């Protein structure tokens, strides 16, 4: 947990961990992370409301959210060390309050818009 | 150390005990008739005395000082990037040694290290007053400390190349094995060692440690700031007209860094403090763009932006920089349009080229420049250094300062086209690193062309079938680009018998307005929800905050989701439920709304005084500070 | 940065250096050696200004009190600095009996050389002696300096200076002492009308008062083809009621803007003015709805453009 951070812009934490899930369907995919990008300047219609899009990407790619994306986090793995990091993950899971508390990466937009 | 020479053109004496050659010099210079005395062969040496000070840039000395016009100007195509022309004077037979030095350079600067270390070697051995074999062989230790280092990261690194083949490799290393960089100048002979002492520096490993040093005189708060910007001009002219490779090593990339960055952060300083004091700084030119765009990694031009106010600087010479700029989009072109991508120059150039492309936001454009350059960026410019959504946003920056023209509208529907034809293969994904995709494009289309209308994708549309599934759903999120007959065509595609069908063609654009039987399907999934009570449900209250539904009944489902209430009915909502983190998920339009509902309003704003005062967020205080809420 | 929040340890360490400090200023300046002190007047200046953070036991304080009053060469610490650099000191430390008796003897030497006509204290801070009086009575509210007022009673005519040297300081007086330089001092110029208002002496402005500033604007007016901000702020909190101050602007800034807030022109507004309001004149303002939101986007510039957190602190706290 040395290299995990508390981003507080978007009160999510970047950490370096893939997590194994079980959808609301009994899907299972393995070795998932997400990628936040806050992204506050971003060209929205009429229906978009948050200020962050989250990429979920198992395997090494993307996925496709078409259904309901209600998941529970099944076990948390760390990529420097494969100590599980999972009881962690659900204790600021549960802090946090927030959708995805922790995040592979996340991008910030903010500074490499034009209006900025 | 007879005299001290200011960086602004004029001498000053000291430690000086003798004669004052120096002022009898500048007194003779300013007056022909002291001139006339000298004799014949003094008469030709003063002459050229004055042309080596006038063009070194030494006017007086420090009393006769006046209007002292520092112009930087440095004369060097490796600078420029002239790249086209330093390959034309390479190709050209040298007629002397320097323009074999020049040419080993450029190449050099070319990334055809190989051929520099053999012209290197081979002035080496036709050199032998000495100032040419001295630098070249300073050059050629340098070249081979560049080889080195390439073999090494690319061994180290996204497909394995040998630009340097190991016969020539093996061959380098044993014609350097235990060369002495320290060694070369007191190996000289000593009419060299004395004529020429100042290039002493060049065989140090080091040699801009005063120079960095001499930059927390821009970290003060009690001119400075010409001092340091007028050595970084000697420094750069210097290494660039005198053709030493030292130039392109990350001491001297790390030294511009520094000493711009702390330039331009010293002018901010300034300007906030005469704001502070008056109640209401640096100008930056061709040459400064040009040392930002190649010194300059993105994250240390990113660092400049967040710290200083860089829209308040403002950027002179601008056909200069759009020169440089479309020059750096034909390059791309040649490297990558041809087959002509050379790994060891595209290692160094793409670097550059990504950088003036991003701080080119700040420069005014011509159109026909504006179009050269955006289509480099958006087709020739390769995709292991800008993915989708990086390329996305280097688009985006140049409308800042460049409204989006019609040309520059076609360029993008090009790429739109294109990004769409890409996607017949099943396989084929946009990758993207910021989360940007060709979505992104058409939405920046329509954000400038509200009314745009895009012929080739309606076609595509128009051909589409059932088999493609890819091409359907990508050219979904280019809908608002697509003709009425081909957004009929794709819209019977999509079925929304479900709410998960119906958020999913909410998130792709499918839906842009809330139909009854859509209202009646939310309202199915809150009775199903509430009957299951003993995730979309803050979207629904948003939406029906948003006046995005007016169906009036969703109150049924106050009452065990805290967003949902708070959203729904403001004013009867129990803020010792509300979380203060809802704000910071909340785009711009949200938070702007729940500003002016006019209810709630004073609840959202003594939270935020609470975050603020407890935590001192720099996000909760932006919220506070520009919606107010 | 809020360093006020910052814990400072080994504080008993931090003591002994600031104590050190202060011997050395005793020494320097009682054999001074001009080569050591060009560069060590720079560090002791430093260390008394950042001892502010730092509690101090009585021996200790009351050393570094005196070193810095007495034996702290003027050449670097004026009056007005000097007081500053004491009542930083007083932050950690509530002004005790042994320093509050430093400060009087501080005064009663300052009344002395004021004895002398030749004597004017100079301090680029604005603060003076009277500043010192004024933070000994705020530190215990009846303060009775019995050699000040002593030298009250044994004054005369001849002496100018001394006169209202003493009339600044007259809440440290006694009984009688006062009452003789009343007596002996009237209320007739901006000065003494400023002194008076200060130590108390006049609560309410009579019109002859007002009749003074009016003249005061007059002569400035004059002229023109500190005193008016002090005037332009009584004008806002109603305090004088004359209303014929608007024929006044267009000199300073500051009175432009307090006297007639709808009128100022807002690109003349300066941002520092806001940190030297207090509390009261600050709600003033922000309740004054007439440049209320000007205020307010100046307070957002500076709290984006602007490293400084006072501004924020302000907004914060009064909506300003």
């Not at chain 2, 739109?416 to 994904?429: C, R």
Request: hydrophobic share 40%; aromatic share 16%; net charge negative.
């Amino acid at each position: 947990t040395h290299d995990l951070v508390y981003h507080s812009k978007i009160n999510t934490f970047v950490w370096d961990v893939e997590f194994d899930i079980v959808l609301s369907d009994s899907k299972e995919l393995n070795k998932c992370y997400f990628v936040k990008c806050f992204n506050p300047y971003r060209i929205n219609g009429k229906c978009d409301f948050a200020v962050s899009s989250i990429d979920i990407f198992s395997e090494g790619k993307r996925l496709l959210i078409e259904n309901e994306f209600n998941f529970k986090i099944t076990k948390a793995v760390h990529v420097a060390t494969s100590k599980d990091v999972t009881e962690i993950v659900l204790h600021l899971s549960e802090r946090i309050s927030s959708p995805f508390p922790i995040v592979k990466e996340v991008v910030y937009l903010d500074w490499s818009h034009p209006q900025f | 150390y007879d005299y001290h020479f200011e960086v602004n053109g004029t001498v000053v004496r000291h430690k000086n005990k003798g004669f004052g050659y120096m002022e009898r010099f500048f007194e003779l210079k300013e007056s022909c008739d002291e001139r006339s005395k000298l004799s014949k062969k003094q008469y030709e040496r003063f002459n050229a005395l004055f042309n080596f000070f006038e063009k070194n840039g030494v006017i007086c000395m420090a009393k006769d000082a006046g209007t002292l016009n520092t112009s930087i100007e440095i004369n060097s195509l490796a600078y420029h990037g002239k790249y086209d022309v330093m390959k034309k004077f390479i190709e050209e037979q040298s007629v002397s040694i320097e323009d074999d030095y020049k040419k080993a350079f450029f190449l050099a600067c070319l990334g055809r290290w190989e051929e520099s270390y053999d012209l290197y070697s081979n002035i080496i051995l036709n050199s032998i007053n000495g100032c040419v074999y001295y630098l070249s062989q300073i050059n050629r230790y340098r070249i081979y400390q560049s080889i080195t280092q390439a073999v090494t990261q690319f061994n180290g690194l996204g497909r394995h190349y040998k630009p340097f083949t190991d016969e020539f490799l093996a061959r380098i290393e044993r014609e350097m094995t235990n060369f002495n960089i320290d060694d070369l100048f007191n190996g000289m002979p000593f009419e060299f060692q004395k004529k020429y002492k100042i290039l002493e520096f060049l065989s140090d490993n080091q040699f801009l440690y005063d120079d960095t040093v001499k930059l927390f005189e821009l970290t003060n708060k009690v001119s400075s700031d010409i001092v340091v910007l007028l050595r970084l001009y000697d420094n750069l002219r210097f290494l660039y007209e005198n053709c030493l490779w030292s130039v392109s090593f990350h001491e001297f990339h790390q030294y511009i860094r520094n000493s711009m960055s702390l330039l331009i952060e010293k002018a901010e300083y300034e300007r906030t403090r005469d704001i502070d004091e008056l109640g209401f700084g640096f100008f930056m030119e061709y040459y400064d763009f040009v040392n930002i765009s190649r010194h300059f990694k993105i994250d240390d031009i990113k660092n400049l932006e967040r710290s200083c106010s860089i829209d308040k600087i403002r950027f002179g010479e601008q056909e200069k920089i759009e020169e440089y700029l479309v020059g750096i989009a034909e390059e791309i072109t040649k490297q990558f349009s041809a087959n002509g991508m050379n790994v060891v120059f595209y290692t160094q150039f793409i670097s550059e080229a990504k950088a003036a492309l991003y701080f080119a936001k700040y420069v005014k454009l011509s159109e026909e420049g504006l179009g050269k350059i955006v289509k480099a960026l958006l087709f020739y410019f390769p995709e292991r250094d800008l993915d989708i959504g990086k390329r996305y946003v280097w688009l985006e920056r140049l409308t800042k300062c460049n409204e989006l023209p019609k040309s520059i509208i076609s360029i993008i529907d090009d790429f739109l086209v294109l990004q769409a034809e890409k996607h017949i293969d099943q396989n084929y994904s946009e990758v993207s690193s910021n989360g940007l995709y060709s979505r992104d494009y058409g939405a920046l289309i329509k954000h400038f062309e509200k009314n745009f209308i895009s012929k080739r994708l309606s076609e595509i549309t128009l051909c589409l079938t059932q088999d493609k599934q890819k091409q359907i759903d990508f050219l979904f999120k280019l809908l608002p680009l697509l003709s009425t007959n081909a957004k009929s065509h794709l819209l019977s595609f999509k079925s929304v018998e479900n709410i998960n069908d119906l958020m999913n063609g909410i998130r792709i654009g499918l839906i842009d307005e809330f139909t009854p039987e859509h209202e009646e399907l939310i309202i199915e999934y809150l009775e199903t929800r509430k009957v299951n009570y003993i995730d979309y449900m803050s979207t629904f209250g948003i939406w029906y905050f948003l006046e995005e539904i007016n169906n009036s009944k969703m109150e049924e489902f106050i009452g065990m989701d805290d967003q949902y209430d708070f959203f729904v009915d403001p004013e009867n909502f129990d803020y010792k439920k509300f979380i203060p983190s809802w704000l910071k998920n909340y785009n711009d339009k949200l938070l702007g709304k729940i500003a002016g509902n006019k209810h709630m309003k004073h609840h959202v704003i003594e939270v935020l005084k609470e975050r603020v005062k407890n935590s001192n967020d720099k996000r909760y205080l932006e919220i506070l500070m520009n919606y107010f809420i």
